[PDB]
Amino acid sequence: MKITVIGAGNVGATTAFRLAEKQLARELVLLDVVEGIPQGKALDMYESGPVGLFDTKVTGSNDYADTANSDIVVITAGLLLSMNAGIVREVTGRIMEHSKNPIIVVVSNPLDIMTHVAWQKSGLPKERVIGMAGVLDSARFRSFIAMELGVSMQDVTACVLGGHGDAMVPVVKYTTVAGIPVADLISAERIAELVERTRTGGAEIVNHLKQGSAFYSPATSVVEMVESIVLDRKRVLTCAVSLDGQYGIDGTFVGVPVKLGKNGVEHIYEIKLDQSDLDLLQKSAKIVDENCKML
Amino acid sequence: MKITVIGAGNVGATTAFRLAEKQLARELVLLDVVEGIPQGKALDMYESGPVGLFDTKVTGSNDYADTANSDIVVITAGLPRKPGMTLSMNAGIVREVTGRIMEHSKNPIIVVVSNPLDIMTHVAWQKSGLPKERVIGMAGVLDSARFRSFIAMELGVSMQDVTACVLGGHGDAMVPVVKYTTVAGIPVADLISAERIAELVERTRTGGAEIVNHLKQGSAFYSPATSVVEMVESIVLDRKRVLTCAVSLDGQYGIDGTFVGVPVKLGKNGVEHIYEIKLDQSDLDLLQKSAKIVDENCKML
Amino acid sequence: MKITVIGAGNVGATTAFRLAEKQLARELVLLDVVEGIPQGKALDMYESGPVGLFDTKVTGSNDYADTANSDIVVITAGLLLSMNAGIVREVTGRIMEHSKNPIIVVVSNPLDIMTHVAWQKSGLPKERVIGMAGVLDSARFRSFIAMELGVSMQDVTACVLGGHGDAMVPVVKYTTVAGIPVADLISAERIAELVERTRTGGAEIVNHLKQGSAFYSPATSVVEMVESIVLDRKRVLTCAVSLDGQYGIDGTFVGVPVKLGKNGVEHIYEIKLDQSDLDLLQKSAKIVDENCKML
Amino acid sequence: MKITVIGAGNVGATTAFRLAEKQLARELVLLDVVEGIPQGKALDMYESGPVGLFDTKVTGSNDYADTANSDIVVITAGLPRKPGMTLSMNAGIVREVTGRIMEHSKNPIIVVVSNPLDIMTHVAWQKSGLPKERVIGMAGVLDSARFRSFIAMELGVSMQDVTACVLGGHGDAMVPVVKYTTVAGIPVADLISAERIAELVERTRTGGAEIVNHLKQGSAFYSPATSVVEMVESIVLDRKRVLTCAVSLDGQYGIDGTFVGVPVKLGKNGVEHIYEIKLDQSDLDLLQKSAKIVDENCKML
Ligand SMILES: NC(=O)c1ccc[n+]([C@@H]2O[C@H](COP(=O)([O-])OP(=O)(O)OC[C@H]3O[C@@H](n4cnc5c(N)ncnc54)[C@H](O)[C@@H]3O)[C@@H](O)[C@H]2O)c1
């Protein structure tokens, strides 16, 4: 098992470190454009092995040749829509030169589009390319409900399809505390607020740090997904994937419940959404598929 | 944090070992009536510390003075069962044990595991003289675990993403709420036929017996030990987790005094909140019938 | 990764469970001769998955056909020397019918001989077959030193070659607390005692339980070894392996420091022992190689 | 168990996150001088709890009253360094911080991380007014970690099996004892040429600078955070671990009063024992020279 995390900033570095200590890979390559930074961070991570008790071979590089034969590739490269799309497209192209069949997990925003960009570029089947967002939105939502109710975050479940912001589709219907519907524990008034805080959760962090975005939750989320693939856990998580009919959408990437296994997306769940939500999901997908045209 | 586990059998020991490795306690005492067994299992466990990387001081004893001033006590003392069985004996055991520990620990949190659970928990609570918040029994978590593992098998999904609501107690007293059973929030009724769900609900119902018939000379202990610890960890780490445990109600679900398996918030103060969820008439009905049967025996004792 | 643990008694069951929760395998097969027991224990373990958060597919069986294509096989079968040798030889033969190239880790006593029996039977190269004992003896010794000094067991190191009992070769020279020689922390008087307690450590447990042997420490030890192989950790642990010259011994299995990787024994370390110890190791190996003749 | 971490930077935050996930504390406070950063990093961390499965209450603050009654305090406040550097400033920072926390916590265990370590630890201890057992600094563990990772690379063995003894402090004050450096007990001198060992001893010596030159805008934090936590975990779980930490000697190694990096037994009472190992004249010599230099500055302050 050889994993490559493109991008050595907070997100990709926090991600690689977690992936290193969890030992989900024998070889882990942290690659970035800036000289030095990737090499120093990967070394700092490696020298952590004797105390954290992991033996993952973590190396930082600038040469894609060091990412040859990677099984999984995490793309966190980013710095507009036309710019990043180019960054993502180029990166995908460079890795596809040294790896003929990996699973690509995208973490760049706009997620859905960036994921599409990468996919259509790699030439890999829609099963081998996915994006991360739902796990993260779900996580923020779950933590808000926890703070509200004074319960453990492990017992809170939150079904969140779609993308970030106005494109987010939180299914309050499939959201619970130990199976007990949130609707029976929290007023709709407050639930509406917690749903709002979730839509603008990334920004809430940014408004705090001023510089850059959030990276702990985002990194932890990406790993949960990678872990499922590596350990063939068959976990069901809301990821961005290319639909092929479900939800009355075809071709365009959307955030829907999926089963992640050694072969990536092993199943797309078409849950029962009510018109409202099902509409927002289709509009949002139209807007997205729109942009994927210019590109 | 000192944790005492009465009973060095399959459940008690497996539980103790798990507690040791997880390092939830600084001092872990494994006491039993039969001499030798707790000491040997305790040593075998401790000698595991260098490879499992934990330093919990696990001590096996036959003397209750060693349990003095405990924060949490796990009671697993009692005879299991053979293929063909289904309280007179354990009632006395559990009571003797409880009164025995209370001499050395005046304010612990007791977690009862001994069967018949609901009733054995009442016996301990009754004998301890501790407020009902400090005494609870383990059952729901295990029942839920089995239901989840089955659904996972059926759908081929991770057991982590399956949620199962199960209240009441074991056997016909088991009230599994398919309504609050899901796969990543998605209702199981939307993924598995009702006909097949009832069977899985059946397997769950007779889950313990399925293990007993296989083992033939005893019952299950791995899942039971894992479940007990999930509960203790919540208390130790004050995680405020919501788990189905056997506790003494005070009106919720239309039941008073008797111990029932309901969703509760578990913290360092024990039962910090009892959740009275929404159940249809048929479920409240069973839950209350069961509750009366249990309430029957308890008084008969 | 598919692992099979032969023997469903305390040792093999405690082992399989630990292997299940650590997720070192996708498929884990617990096989035994007695009907029912393996099926019940493996099920009890599996139903533990939702609370212990692992998804290892653990199944109990009586049909070796269910152990087909196993990568690693842990043999804990046992119930005299001629008896067990037959048990081990038969088991090895049955698995070799459904798996052409696994790594075999033996846990039956007498270890060295039982390991040889299995090896010469499987027909596999000496790299694919090893036995467990040193890790366990080291572990008991390490814990005694810890109890004596009032320090953590993680920081105690103990080099132990040879086998159990009189065949045990504890190198007090290579035994330390954070690198600090035990000889500088504990009197030779007491060290002699702690070394004695180690030689008879298995029996100390048995004298307590009356029925059967110890199984927690023995199981934890076996896993450490298996973990190293599965995760290609390249750990250095004293295991029983077929030497090929080192220590002035050839062919006969001995407990020596080795590097365990995805290919099993990747290196045998010939440390510098003083005559005394080096002698006890050769005598012990002669006695062993003696018995491996009758068989 | 309440743990305060002063400094929400790369080391402070990475450390806090690790502490949160490991659940070693119920309440974890991340305080900094710059407003916003600790709050944001704290939230980002907490929002990680549902996927990382931990419930530690991580709160980011700018107010010291939030650190009140802390059991353990980790000081990482201070300016790092850029390629080309090697105390005047941090001395004031560390002292201000220490006197600030002591107003709200009257008996914590302070773990200093701010450079120059040996000296910054003296500054805190001096200002806290706490017995020398309650104040220690982190350095040895990190130095040892780097040496181990190098040997592992060189021999192709697990880093878990490599043991490295390193005393003193960073730089020329670093006293790595090749004599007590091994691979599964086997002396490294028996596995690696002396010539190559000295180089690895060199890399270790300038390890931090190697990271600094790569990063260019800051220093290392992953290994440093991992090392600090290894120490805190020992205290929290009273594991009595033996780690090389910077502490105030009282004669051992022929050094009095000054802080030196020596092997110590770490428990809930802090430094529970200082180990005076056997060193040859040359090593005792450096250790003492370094110690005097450090003892020099401290008084100059
Ligand atoms: N999926 C989500 O919901 C989510 C959450 C958080 C952040 N993000 C996004 O993830 C990205 C990384 O966030 P961060 O906080 O780690 O940022 P960052 O700026 O610290 O790190 C990104 C790193 O990528 C490098 N980079 C840029 N272009 C590159 C290229 N072509 N090849 C290789 N490296 C390149 C930069 O130089 C930089 O060091 C951002 O685009 C951000 O918007 C997404």
Ligand SMILES: NC(=O)c1ccc[n+]([C@@H]2O[C@H](COP(=O)([O-])OP(=O)(O)OC[C@H]3O[C@@H](n4cnc5c(N)ncnc54)[C@H](O)[C@@H]3O)[C@@H](O)[C@H]2O)c1
């Ligand atoms: N709540 C559940 O879901 C659940 C699951 C499994 C087992 N159980 C119950 O837990 C109990 C233990 O199961 P087990 O498999 O560990 O059994 P076991 O027979 O292996 O062990 C029970 C131990 O209790 C000891 N014991 C008996 N009387 C005692 C007394 N007065 N004081 C101290 N120790 C005493 C025995 O000597 C024995 O070692 C049984 O009552 C069983 O039915 C409940």
Ligand SMILES: NC(=O)c1ccc[n+]([C@@H]2O[C@H](COP(=O)([O-])OP(=O)(O)OC[C@H]3O[C@@H](n4cnc5c(N)ncnc54)[C@H](O)[C@@H]3O)[C@@H](O)[C@H]2O)c1
């Ligand atoms: N390596 C060590 O240092 C070490 C430590 C402890 C125990 N051991 C040895 O390990 C073995 C297991 O110990 P245990 O405590 O688990 O014992 P146990 O008797 O509880 O379990 C062994 C199981 O193997 C089964 N068995 C016997 N022959 C078999 C065959 N041909 N095929 C399949 N299953 C068979 C039995 O029926 C039994 O259920 C013993 O031989 C013991 O002496 C070695």
Ligand SMILES: NC(=O)c1ccc[n+]([C@@H]2O[C@H](COP(=O)([O-])OP(=O)(O)OC[C@H]3O[C@@H](n4cnc5c(N)ncnc54)[C@H](O)[C@@H]3O)[C@@H](O)[C@H]2O)c1
């Ligand atoms: N002991 C070791 O082995 C070791 C390893 C790495 C770093 N360090 C040292 O640790 C310190 C922090 O390193 P870093 O990488 O986290 O740096 P950093 O610059 O990322 O973070 C330091 C944080 O301290 C805060 N700060 C400054 N003055 C403060 C005051 N008076 N009160 C409260 N907060 C204040 C800053 O605002 C900043 O967020 C440095 O002094 C560095 O040299 C020691």
